[PDB]
Amino acid sequence: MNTVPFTSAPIEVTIGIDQYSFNVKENQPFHGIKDIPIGHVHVIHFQHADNSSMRYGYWFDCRMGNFYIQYDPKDGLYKMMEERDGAKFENIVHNFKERQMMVSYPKIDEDDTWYNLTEFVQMDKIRKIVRKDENQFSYVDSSMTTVQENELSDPAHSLNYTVINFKSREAIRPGHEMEDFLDKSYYLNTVMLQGIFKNSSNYFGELQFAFLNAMFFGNYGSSLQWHAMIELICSSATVPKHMLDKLDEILYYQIKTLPEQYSDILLNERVWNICLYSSFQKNSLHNTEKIMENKYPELL
Amino acid sequence: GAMNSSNYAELFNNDIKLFVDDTNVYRVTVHKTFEGNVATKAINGCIFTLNPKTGHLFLKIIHTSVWAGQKRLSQLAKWKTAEEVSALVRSLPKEEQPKQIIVTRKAMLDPLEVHMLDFPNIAIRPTELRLPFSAAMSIDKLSDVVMKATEPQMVLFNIYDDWLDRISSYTAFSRLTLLLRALKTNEESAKMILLSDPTITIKSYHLWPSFTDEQWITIESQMRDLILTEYGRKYNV
Ligand SMILES: Cc1ccsc1C(=O)NN
Ligand SMILES: Cc1ccsc1C(=O)NN
Ligand SMILES: Cc1ccsc1C(=O)NN
């Protein structure tokens, strides 16, 4: 189990750690989060009490370094930093655990939710979507745009998700116009899986990361990416059976975790009704269709 | 974006543009089988691709053999239309290629867009106008060449004859759509109107009769009467 220590909490803030969240009051004696499960990526995120504008946060993996949070009064945000002095880190943290000034990552033993949301998400791949190579952790906020959004404006602050565009020469083989537009298997299997992602694990990792950025930061371009990646599979007649079964599990846990009150802005009615009721894979997502119909029947 | 009555004179500016109408591409008769089921028999069709400024009509005749062994023909017909329009554009010198293609049915937008990805500078546009181009097969010399075809064929027609010698493109297009609206609302009446007087002929090199300027005003009035009239008989007013 690992620890993310806080210099202090000078401004009132709601702090998220993965799917959990808690309120810290202005100048409250808070010095961080302990008992963080090793083996998974994590996200620590923030929404200030005064300005709910800009949810922001940091993706990290405690196996890759010792990280802490310190408020910056000039830039006005909680910043993640890496402590390279391992002995100092050890000495400073033990004191906060002794003075009991940290919240415990509150995982229920039965609970596989976080694993099931991040199964294919790797820090190395996150760091290629979010380019800032001098840090081992990655900053994301509500406002960041995607490379594809910039093509339709600061390239350094972009989410470099894989561009998916169903009416593009990449997606459509000369002479197979109708075939390739109506059945996206070529684009999914040859262009995307064999050519760009190399395997379905990397595809699912990006799909899961996009969902999590949409849910935790309200990042609109991430929501677009998540739906595009779902639609590309559902609109393919030829999809490996293990991929369809895994996608059904992935989406099931995403839909289960989605806050009920955010469904209207995070779920695209057209994509879900097409995928579940019209697409080639309309009969292949049993778990996802069942939870969607019981939790969000209005959307359908 | 979409073409409507607000931007109607844009059709007659000097940017090359084509209308594409696909309503006569896939044509069938429906009939009973010996077992008392129903079956279709396809007949030859055509793509109606028209330059509204010049009157040049690229009539691609769709021979029934193109449907042999194919499924979901109504969907295929849209993609076949887009394939042939794309092939036509590529066949034209760069300086003759259109800047815009306006489809008369919104269901042609995605098929044409996908086929023209190579041409990102050609705009594919819908229209809100309810243009009567389906009635093109009511023109005698066009229906004849379509029904006689034994193989795929393109014939280049001018649907304005020599009207542009005497009137503007705007007025020619208005006359054309009035004639076609009439043929679509009541084909027999419309055709009676156009051919009643045996001293007004259709030249061997013309599709429509050789009306004087004055006779065209009479004809045009009779067509508006017809369209208003059948706007009565249909709706009882
Ligand atoms: C809060 C904290 C914990 C580990 S290092 C650190 C600090 O203030 N400077 N590194
Ligand atoms: C090309 C052709 C053949 C018979 S009439 C005709 C025509 O378009 N006249 N304007
Ligand atoms: C009878 C008639 C004449 C001009 S439009 C029209 C019609 O039925 N539109 N739906």
Q: Are residues A104 and A195 in the same domain?
A: no
Q: Are residues A6 and A95 in the same domain?
A: yes
Q: Are residues A165 and A188 in the same domain?
A: yes
Residue A32 CA: nearest ligand 1 atom is: 1
CATH superfamily placement of domain B164-237? Prp8 RNase H domain, fingers region (1.20.80.40)
The resolution of the experimental structure, rounded to one decimal in Å, is 1.5
Domain boundary among A143, A169, A196: A143
Domain boundary among A143, A160, A181: A143
In angstroms, rounded to a whole number, what is the distance separating the alpha carbons of residues A130 and A158? 7
Nearest CA in chain B to A171: B114
Question: Between A and B, how many CB-CB pairs are < 8 A?
Answer: 22
- Among B220, B200, B195, CA closest to B210: B200
Contacts of B110 in chain A (CB under 8 A): 167, 181
Q: Are residues A150 and A282 in the same domain?
A: yes
Distances (CA, A) of B108 to A71, A264, B23, B115: 56, 32, 10, 11
- Among A172, A178, A187, most B C-beta atoms within 10 A, so best to mutate, is A178
Query: Residues lining ligand 1, CB < 6 A?
Result: A 5, 7, 68, 70, 83, 89, 92
Angle at B212 between CA B209 and CA B215, to 5 degrees: 85
Whether B73 has its CB under 8 Å from any CB of chain A: the answer is no
What are residue A81's phi and psi, to 5 degrees? -140, 160
- Give the residue extent of every domain in chain B: 9-163, 164-237
Domain ranges, residue A30: 1-143
**What is residue A196's DSSP assignment?**
I
Q: How far is CA A293 from the centre of its chain?
A: 24
User: Is any ligand 2 atom within 6 A of the Cβ of residue B67?
Assistant: no
Q: Are residues A130 and A157 in the same domain?
A: no
Q: Are residues A156 and A116 in the same domain?
A: no
**What is residue A146's DSSP assignment?**
B
Residue B228 CA: nearest ligand 3 atom is: 3
User: Is any ligand 3 atom within 6 A of the Cβ of residue B230?
Assistant: yes
In angstroms, rounded to a whole number, what is the distance separating the alpha carbons of residues B106 and A169? 22
Residue B79: how many other CB atoms lie within 10 Å: 21
Q: Are residues A154 and A300 in the same domain?
A: yes
Protein residue closest via CA to atom 4 of ligand 3: B227
Domain boundary among A88, A110, A143: A143
Token pair 């009439």: residue:
B182
- Number of domains comprising chain A: 2
Q: Are residues A130 and A165 in the same domain?
A: no
Q: Which amino acid is at B220?
A: E
Q: Which residues pair with B31 in a beta bridge?
A: B39
Question: By three-state DSSP, how is residue A257 classified?
Answer: helix
- Among B210, B2, B229, B227, CA closest to B135: B227
Q: Are residues A184 and A288 in the same domain?
A: yes
Q: Which amino acid is at B215?
A: Q
What are residue B203's phi and psi, to 5 degrees? -60, 155
In angstroms, rounded to a whole number, what is the distance separating the alpha carbons of residues A115 and A18? 11
Q: Which CATH architecture has domain B9-163?
A: 2-Layer Sandwich (3.30)
Q: Are residues A20 and A41 in the same domain?
A: yes
What are residue A61's phi and psi, to 5 degrees? -140, 110
B111–A168: do the CB atoms touch at under 8 Å?
no
Q: Are residues A96 and A169 in the same domain?
A: no
Q: Are residues A1 and A97 in the same domain?
A: yes
Q: Which residues pair with B58 in a beta bridge?
A: B49, B156
- A144, containing H or E segment: none
A172–B117: do the CB atoms touch at under 8 Å?
yes
Tell me the technique behind this structure.
X-ray
Check: CB of residue B176 under 8 Å from CB of residue B159.
yes
A14 Ramachandran zone, left/alpha/beta (phi>0; psi -120 to 50): beta
Nearest CA in chain B to A179: B79
Sheet arrangement for strand B123-125: B123-125, B100-103, B17-21, B45-50, B56-62, B153-158
> Which residues neighbour B60 within 8 Å (Cβ) at sequence distance 6 or greater?
B46, B47, B49, B84, B88, B152, B153, B154
